[PDB]
Amino acid sequence: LVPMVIEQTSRGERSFDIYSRLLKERVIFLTGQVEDHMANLIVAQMLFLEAENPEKDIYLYINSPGGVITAGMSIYDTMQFIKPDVSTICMGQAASMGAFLLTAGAKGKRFCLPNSRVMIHQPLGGYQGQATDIEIHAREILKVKGRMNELMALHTGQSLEQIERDTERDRFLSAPEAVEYGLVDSILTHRN
């Protein structure tokens, strides 16, 4: 059950759900396995906030175990397209897509909690059919792997070859380790 909160506005008081109240403050929650349905919902929130104030920054909280590659790309392309800077935050964990979207945030505004975890791995996929069709689908996932490693190298700042070596197998990066790798910029330990 989602709770409802009251906001003391000039034009009386209004009741908003906990998530809608934070949406008004340019805060978007990314939780659970990434999919087409939820991705189209985050895209709508990003576009709506852009209209209200393009200058103001948008905050994104990433606590997810990963998901579909295509759905995540819609969010990534939307973030780069919109003028406002998206400040990504990692709570709990950030898998392959959660980490890719995390590092995709604006330079200097990527954060992670001290006890948070990060995990980066190469894409996973499969196809059943004739050898002819297998070769086709295999070419794309290989191309997607190279495409995702190029973008991650850009944000992290590391060489393309280094990302390939690490992404070959599942790798776990702690919050301080992520700072050195370049996925995030700083850690939010306490409010200052």
Binding site: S10, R11, G12, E13
Partner: protein
């Protein structure tokens, strides 16, 4: 009573009633007393954005403010609406005491 500029009524009519007993003599009417009933209904409505422009409520209070503290108030001669009519009775309410009585239903819950 209602805010000025509306079809309901004007607060200046209160003096007309006080003049009837005073024989329309402003000299003695200034030393009179007045009673206003059902003042509770004039209270502001809950969480009003003010775009409604409350005439029955808040508007009445804004007009009474200067009246209670004391100010010359034009009074029509008899049963007439405020208008460019030259004849108007200037009655000062500074010495005219006012006793506002009302049943503030629901105030017990507030206290």
């Amino acid at each position: 009573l209602t805010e000025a500029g509306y079809v309901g009524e004007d607060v200046e009519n209160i003096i007309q009633k006080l003049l009837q007993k005073s024989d329309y003599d402003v000299q003695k009417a200034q030393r009179g007393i007045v009673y206003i009933d059902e003042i509770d209904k004039i209270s502001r409505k809950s969480d009003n954005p003010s775009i409604t422009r409350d005439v029955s409520g808040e508007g009445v209070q804004q007009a009474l403010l200067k009246l209670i503290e004391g100010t010359v108030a034009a009074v029509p001669p008899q049963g007439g609406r405020k208008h460019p009519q030259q004849e108007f009775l200037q009655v000062d309410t500074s010495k005219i005491l006012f006793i506002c009585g009302g049943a503030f239903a629901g105030l017990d819950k507030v206290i």
